[PDB]
Amino acid sequence: AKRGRKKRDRKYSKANHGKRPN
Amino acid sequence: PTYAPKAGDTTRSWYVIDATDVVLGRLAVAAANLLRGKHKPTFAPNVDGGDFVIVINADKVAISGDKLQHKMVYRHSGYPGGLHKRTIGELMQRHPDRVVEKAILGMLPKNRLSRQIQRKLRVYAGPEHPHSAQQPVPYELKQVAQ
Amino acid sequence: TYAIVKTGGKQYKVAVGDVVKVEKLESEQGEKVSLPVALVVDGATVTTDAKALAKVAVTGEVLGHTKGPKIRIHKFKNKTGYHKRQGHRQQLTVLKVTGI
Amino acid sequence: ARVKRAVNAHKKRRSILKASRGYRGQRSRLYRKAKEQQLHSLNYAYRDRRARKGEFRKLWIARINAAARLNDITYNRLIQGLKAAGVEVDRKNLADIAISDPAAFTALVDVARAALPEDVNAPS
Amino acid sequence: GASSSRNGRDSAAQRLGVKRYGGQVVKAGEILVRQRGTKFHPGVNVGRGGDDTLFAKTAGAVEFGIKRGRKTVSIVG
Amino acid sequence: SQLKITQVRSTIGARWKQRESLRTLGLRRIRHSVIREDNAATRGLIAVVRHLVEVEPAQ
Amino acid sequence: STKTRGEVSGGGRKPYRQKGTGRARQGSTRAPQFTGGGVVHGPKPRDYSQRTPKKM
RNA sequence: GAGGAGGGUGGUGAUGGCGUGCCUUUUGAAGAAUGAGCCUGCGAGUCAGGGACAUGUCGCAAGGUUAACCCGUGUGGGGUA
RNA sequence: AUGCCGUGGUGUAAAGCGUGGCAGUGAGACGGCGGGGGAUAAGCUCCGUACGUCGAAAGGGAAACAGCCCAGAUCGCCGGC
RNA sequence: CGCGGCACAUCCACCUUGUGGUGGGUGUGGGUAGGGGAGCGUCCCUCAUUCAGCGAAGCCACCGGGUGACCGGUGGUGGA
Ligand SMILES: [Mg+2]
Ligand SMILES: [Mg+2]
Ligand SMILES: [Mg+2]
Ligand SMILES: [Mg+2]
Ligand SMILES: [Mg+2]
Ligand SMILES: [Mg+2]
Ligand SMILES: [Mg+2]
Ligand SMILES: [Mg+2]
Ligand SMILES: [Mg+2]
Ligand SMILES: [Mg+2]
Ligand SMILES: [Mg+2]
Ligand SMILES: [Mg+2]
Ligand SMILES: [Mg+2]
Ligand SMILES: [Mg+2]
Ligand SMILES: [Mg+2]
Ligand SMILES: [Mg+2]
Ligand SMILES: [Mg+2]
Ligand SMILES: [Mg+2]
Ligand SMILES: [Mg+2]
Ligand SMILES: [Mg+2]
Ligand SMILES: [Mg+2]
Ligand SMILES: [Mg+2]
Ligand SMILES: [Mg+2]
Ligand SMILES: [Mg+2]
Ligand SMILES: [Mg+2]
Ligand SMILES: [Mg+2]
Ligand SMILES: [Mg+2]
Ligand SMILES: [Mg+2]
Ligand SMILES: [Mg+2]
Ligand SMILES: [Mg+2]
Ligand SMILES: [Mg+2]
Ligand SMILES: [Mg+2]
Ligand SMILES: [Mg+2]
Ligand SMILES: [Mg+2]
Structure with a gap:
């Protein structure tokens, strides 16, 4: 369940603005 | 057409950097900028410009006390379970020149031309170097104020 | 001595006697053009001033009108069937600097 | 009228294969593989004519920054200084003076340093 | 698995409600309010209809009002 | 008075009432400016689209 | 004049089985x-x- | 033109950056989905009909037009059903 | 609160409408906000949204990265913001 | 944004004032399914004209041209 949590934390960067696909 | 340097234009000099009370990061940046030629206005990214850099007193470099204990250096041999690790503190006992040299090579570009740039780098643990046939001018860290 | 002359929305470092390709000027071959400068260097003096540089001009003589190299464009997106072919020759002017 | 195809069809085959001279392998020899690569080569060329306007500016700024630090100023306050003094020389020529005439580049730093405000960290 | 054998059905939506709003100019015969019951009552120049359908008897302008608690629809000719 | 409205950001991703309010003000592209009157119908257009424009009381 | 596929001589049978040949x-x-x-x-x-x- | 200096063609490309084949089919394929070893040649909206609807265009015009047929060396002239 | 319908002003070229010719599409995807199913799980599934992008959108940023942030590529430039 | 080329729509001016042409503004020009418009190349026939055993076609190479499909020149090979 680690790949889901790590891909979901990278939407909280400055360029993504809280949002990514998926 | 803008200036492109020919073969036979680059003039290479010799610098010596005393490493007594310099942190490892500031020294590796200033050595990498001096080996590549980022300070000369004839810089071209495909040309090995830049100068020879000698780093003496490599055993004295300012590394933090908790970085000597906990920062690790990893090497893998290709064999299963080949992950061999040391600390920074026990590499400064054995090969303090290799610690300073590893910090500079991570700051160079990852290409074929940086392999001919790193051949102009000499790191020595003591205060004495064998290159007195040349005349290495001493180099100090300057920060241009703004 | 040299000057930085401004023509065609671009700047060029010129001296007296230099041959420069610039954008298409509406002047025929053999005529004279007066072109504005952005900097004038005469050895150690640089003159660097809009009140002073607006009184200094570069005199150019038109050698003729040439063409750019042939540029070929074939646009292509991946799995669409989209194609677009296009060509272009840029029109230039050859210019001898006589003034400064 | 039965029409043979070859006089018409060989016209685009000869031109694709001449544009691919100097490619290695099947990309200079075979028409179907030379044509797949001409699609990429003219997209790469289009892409790079618009990229080298930024690539040469990235080269000039690197040389203006190297020459300014010899004259104990950064690139940063040099561009502020020449905008403040009204010197409209572009970066193509400012990185060309820095090589061929270093004395005139020192004379431009002194114009930029003088027009710079007394405390640059104070608000406008 | 079990089933929703007792549910799953509905009738059609009947498109009820106000069809001409206030101050809007109408013709003679235009349906103003379509409703079940008298949610709205007729007024001057408005008739009810067979299934409480509140049409127009006279060309004019629609206006809504109150007449002793009940809300009415009227036309001003 | 009389206002100067300069468009600052893009209409890409903007909504219908935001795009059509920029169309009635007369703006075409980024950094395009226009001179308009300060009546009640104008600053209602500005209030819809104030995150996309920069207004100044200019001549 | 030309011939269509029904007018060229021969060509009545199916020349091999549809599946299993790699053709x-x-x-x-x-x-x-x-x-x-x-x-x-x-x-x-x-x-x-x-x-x-x-x-x- | 004997050699060098400057420029210019033609060939090559040390080195730096950028750079995920083509087709088909998909919400989405560089895809480890499909098809293609290569080259040359061949290989897919055609034709009939006073058909049907709509249009561009030409002739005649409150009219327009013939079909089978007849006569001619033919693409011409007759032929009102 | 918004949204919806009417009306008077003001604004705004490539809005709207009627009737013909020719279509294609009718497998959608993720992101924001509102809700159902599910355990208030799913890169789940089903609706709403003059909401957005991808589909069919290249370029810059998010290391890489259809759908996120910026911005919509007529062509050329060794200019500038 | 700047400077230069092209195209489309619209407007303003005119020259037989839309069958059109010229000039000047402003706007527009990513694009799959698909719709509309305008063209390139191969072959055959008719009329007109012009080349060709002092070398046609076809082929090969080099040098050039056009906004694209593509074109032209010159030379080698060749034989209608
Ligand atoms: Mg696709
Ligand atoms: Mg090669
Ligand atoms: Mg740019
Ligand atoms: Mg119901
Ligand atoms: Mg009844
Ligand atoms: Mg048969
Ligand atoms: Mg046969
Ligand atoms: Mg069969
Ligand atoms: Mg699938
Ligand atoms: Mg699709
Ligand atoms: Mg495959
Ligand atoms: Mg593969
Ligand atoms: Mg295979
Ligand atoms: Mg007849
Ligand atoms: Mg229609
Ligand atoms: Mg469906
Ligand atoms: Mg389908
Ligand atoms: Mg759906
Ligand atoms: Mg939800
Ligand atoms: Mg889903
Ligand atoms: Mg949604
Ligand atoms: Mg993109
Ligand atoms: Mg779109
Ligand atoms: Mg991107
Ligand atoms: Mg990137
Ligand atoms: Mg700037
Ligand atoms: Mg565009
Ligand atoms: Mg288009
Ligand atoms: Mg299409
Ligand atoms: Mg001969
Ligand atoms: Mg022939
Ligand atoms: Mg040719
Ligand atoms: Mg010939
Ligand atoms: Mg010949």
């Missing part, structure tokens, strides 16, 4: 993609007289 399935030897097969939309005997009116 493309073909159906007849006189299909238009073969050498010697029928012409698709080829010339046929036409008359090209028109009906131009007498006054014209």
